[PDB]
């Protein structure tokens, strides 16, 4: 067993320490966040920080890193979409994180395709098999490191046919959702089992 002390971790070069600490949370979700400004200019960003907050009411949280437009659009319009990345699109999803021209939509820049549904004024990713609209409820600034904790209410959900079981469970491996580890590693899930209420 190897031991990395607090001092040893601080000694590491910035990028090495980044890969290392970002690996420590365990698996993370891979989601595309669809937004637009008030003039209808769209944006799309991959994030790995979507976190469940509750089912009643249905609340989802995410942490925004210390592009600017995704957070700015959310703050200005209060609307966004969350779209599962899947194995067919994880390369294009990853590409959204590149730095683009100020007015360059990551939808336009990549092979991903926007989609508007149910009068919701933020674009969905057409290629995503599980996605939902979200309305901003609260944002909390974390001064400890400059992150933003964005809290929103789930509105509408769209999911491939046959994916949602009668008890509400969705098999993420069956719809080919991908997971992330570290800053840049993508994985599919291989189901072990569902375990009953302990």
Which residues are documented as binding site for Ca(2+)? Answer: 107, 110, 112
Q: Closer to its own copies by CB, 1 or 40: give it.
A: 1
Locate the DSSP E strands across 37-184. Answer: 42-47, 51-55, 58-64, 79-84, 114-115, 124-125, 130-142, 147-159, 178-181
Q: How far is the CB of 144 from its own copies (least distance, A)?
A: 6
Which chain residues interact with Ca ion by CB under 5 A? 3, 107
Task: Tell me whether residue 3 or residue 68 sits nearer to Ca ion (CB atom).
Answer: 3
Task: Work out what residue 188 binds among Ca ion, its own copies, none; the CB cut-off runs from 5 to 8 Å by kind.
Answer: its own copies
Nearest to 33 by CA among 57, 7, 6, 65: 65
136 binds, among Ca ion, its own copies, none (CB under 5 to 8 A by kind): none
Task: Select from its own copies, Ca ion, none the partner in contact with residue 31, using the beta carbon and a kind-dependent cut-off of 5 to 8 Å.
Answer: its own copies
C-alpha–C-alpha distance, residues 26 and 85, integer Å: 18
Query: Count of residues for the chain?
Result: 198
Q: Exposure of 163 by Cβ count < 10 A (0-12 exposed, 13-18 middle, 19+ buried)?
A: middle
CB-nearer residue toward its own copies: 39 or 118:
118
Closest to 103 measured CA to CA, from 42, 159, 51, 153: 42
Using the minimum distance from each CB to its own copies, give the nearer residue, 39 or 155: 155
Question: 121 is in the binding site of which of its own copies, Ca ion, none (Cβ under 5 to 8 A by kind)?
Answer: none
Give the residue ranges of the annotated binding site.
107, 110, 112
Considering the complex, what minimum distance in angstroms separates the CB of residue 38 from its own copies?
23
Cα separation, 4 vs 96, in Å, equals 33
Shortest distance, position 74 Cβ to its own copies, whole Å: 17
CB of 109 to Ca ion, least distance (A): 7
75 close to 165: Cβ distance less than 8 angstroms: no
């Amino acid at each position: 067993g190897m031991h990395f002390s607090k001092e040893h971790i601080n000694a590491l070069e910035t990028r090495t320490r980044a890969h290392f600490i970002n690996s420590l949370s365990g698996f993370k979700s891979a989601n595309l966040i669809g937004t637009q400004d008030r003039q209808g200019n769209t944006n799309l960003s991959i994030v790995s920080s979507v976190i469940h907050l509750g089912a009643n009411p249905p609340l989802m949280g995410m942490i925004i890193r210390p592009p600017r437009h995704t957070f700015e659009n959310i703050m200005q319009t209060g609307l966004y979409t969350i779209n599962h990345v899947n194995q067919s699109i994880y390369e294009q999803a990853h590409q959204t994180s590149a730095r683009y021209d100020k007015d360059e939509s990551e939808f336009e820049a990549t092979g991903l395709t926007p989609e508007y549904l149910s009068d919701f004024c933020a674009p969905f990713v057409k290629e995503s098999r599980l996605k939902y609209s979200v309305k901003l409820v609260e944002h909390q600034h974390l001064a400890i490191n400059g992150t933003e904790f964005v809290i929103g209410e789930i509105v509408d959900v769209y999911v491939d046919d046959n994916a949602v079981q009668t008890d509400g469970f969705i098999d993420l491996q069956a719809i080919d959702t991908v997971a992330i580890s570290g800053l840049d590693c993508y994985y599919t899930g291989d189901k072990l089992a569902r375990l009953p209420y302990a």
